[PDB]
């Protein structure tokens, strides 16, 4: 219960600081060709030719049967593809006409806007079952807001703001209806329906709030600031978006780690950031959380968790492969004064020139215009300290000069997208996974539910973890690490994973400890059991070529890297091959991967193992 935003202002404060009549819009006016030329630089011709290809574009009708197919077969794409084509056409024409200024694209902007007003709804087939009727087809009697409608509303606000004049010159009723549609589909429902899930009014501890709150709220807020010229209404609206987002900010951990991972960062942290930027601009700088430490951490997560050459930390049901918008990262980095994020944005560019964001997000498209020339000058670099410690999420990133990166975690087995992975580590060598976390497959008939933990990628059996008395971890809030510490100077991460195992495992403490020195990684296991029932087993997931030159030695050759894993001779090593039938896994790792299995005869109520990994 930080309630940051509410502390920064109440409703009456807010009435003073708001900027009315859209004097806050940072783009030059439409008819100011000189200012736009400057801002566009070299995007100008690129943007015009993109818009030239759309001079003859047929705006697409979305048939009732496309929406109805969601009920019939779960096919969302049949509705989503033409919708998205229409939005992107609309966004592209906007940029192209801001680029040229001659009115060559006004007809198609008008055509797009008028067709959009004629649609019953901007909500997606998939999200429409939240209406009273629960159906996948729009009910002209009701409007809700999802991710689609929000963005569709903000794109339309922006079209309306920018081309109100040439549109009224042609016919004043287009802009009139645009104001009607945005009022009816965004503004009126936003103020009148307390019960949309993503708003998190009538959230209770334990319910989830996720990226929808900052995403939806950011487009709502755009819509108010562009379209609502009554100051008392705007004040009440913005204060409502503040109370809403405050629930997202309170839900998130203060250390800034995204427990979902980097793939959702763009639209989580990144939408939170967008919201705050929009809020700031709209209050002439007066309600700005952009210098909040937590927000900055949330932005540098993306830097810290990006290992290299496409590989990312992938705790839980996330992909080992990952990316990022350089332009969003740059912009975010500027706003919270992270020289780190700014250099990292340049790094992701990887020698390519930054150009305008296209796609279907007006705010991101327009903003990317302003940051574009600075980013082309920034020096490409991925500097970050040797240790990153997220103490609430319980993630530790440690890296040495010789190209090893370890990600270890504590945590609990009820994380979002949870894997039973408490205490697990992943080792990258020069960015290449060597001891890996398999990650996400395509969502079968069990993914969500019990029977989730009968799938192998979700079991502790298939993470870099011991099986205690031959027993794996269990799922649930109760099943977690204790006394997780991180010594930032000695590069030592250490945690008791005992409570992450069920009663049968019969363990008091099991302390799993990671030490990174400059040359090598020492893994220790230190355990005291309530009864020695079965032998412990230890596992490591890997790929490439694996060999066993001698007892207590394994060698892994993967993607140019080559490593030695030294293991107690008390164990007998075997390799298991894991055919990858699921394309969502074989996309990443290829055809198969491997689990190294360490098994023993020894059974002791107390013991320790020392494992050592280095290059050769
Ligand atoms: Zn995993």
Residue numbers in the entry: 28 to 643
Tell me what the authors wrote about this structure, in their words.
In bacteria, however, a different strategy employing a class of enzyme known as polysaccharide lyases (PL) is deployed. PLs selectively target glycans composed of uronic acids with a C4 hydroxyl group linked to the preceding sugar in the glycan chain. This enables PLs to operate through a β-elimination mechanism that relies on proton abstraction from the C5 carbon of the uronic acid sugar ring, resulting in double bond formation between C4 and C5 and elimination of the preceding sugar. The three characterized PL33_1 enzymes were all from Bacteroides species inhabiting the human colon: BT4410 (BtPL33HA) and BcellWH2_04512 (BcPL33HA) are hyaluronidases from Bacteroides thetaiotaomicron VPI-5482 (B. theta) and Bacteroides cellulosilyticus WH2 (B. cell), respectively, while HMPREF1181_01744 (BsPL33Heparosan) is a heparosanase from Bacteroides stercoris CC31F (B. stercoris). The enzymes are 68% identical and contain a larger N-terminal α-helical (α/α)6 toroid domain (residues 21 to 401; BtPL33HA numbering used throughout this section unless specified) and a smaller β-sheet C-terminal domain (residues 402 to 635).
Crystal structures of BtPL33HA and BcPL33HA reveal a two-domain structure. The C-terminal domain possesses an extended loop region between β-strands 5 and 6 (Leu455-Leu484: BtPL33HA, and Ile464-Leu493: BcPL33HA), forming an octahedral Zn2+ coordination site [supported by anomalous X-ray diffraction data], along with the loop region between α-helices 12 and 13 from the N-terminal domain. The two domains oppose each other in such a way that a deep, open-ended cleft is formed resembling an active site that would be compatible with an endo-processive mode of action of BtPL33HA and BcPL33HA. Analysis of the five enzymes via SEC-coupled light scattering and SAXS indicated that the three PL33_1 enzymes BtPL33HA, BcPL33HA, and BsPL33Heparosan are dimeric, while the PL33_2 enzymes ObPL33CS and ObPL33Gellan are monomeric. SAXS data indicate that the dimeric enzymes all bind as head-to-head homodimers, generating elongated envelopes. This is consistent with PISA analysis of the crystal structures of BtPL33HA and BcPL33HA which predicted a buried surface area of ~1,388 Å2 and 1,006 Å2, and a complex significance score of 0.207 and 0.290, respectively. For all five of the analyzed enzymes, AF2-generated models display a closed tunnel-like topography housing the +2 and +1 subsites. The phenol of Y470 moves within 5 to 6 Å of the +1 GlcA and N-acetyl of the −1 GlcNAc, while F475 moves within 5 Å of the +2 GlcNAc, forming the tunnel topography. This differs significantly from the wide-open cleft observed in the crystal structures of both BtPL33HA and BcPL33HA. Fitting of both the BtPL33HA and BcPL33HA crystal structures and their AF2 models to SAXS data indicated that the best fit was for the open conformation observed in the crystal structures.
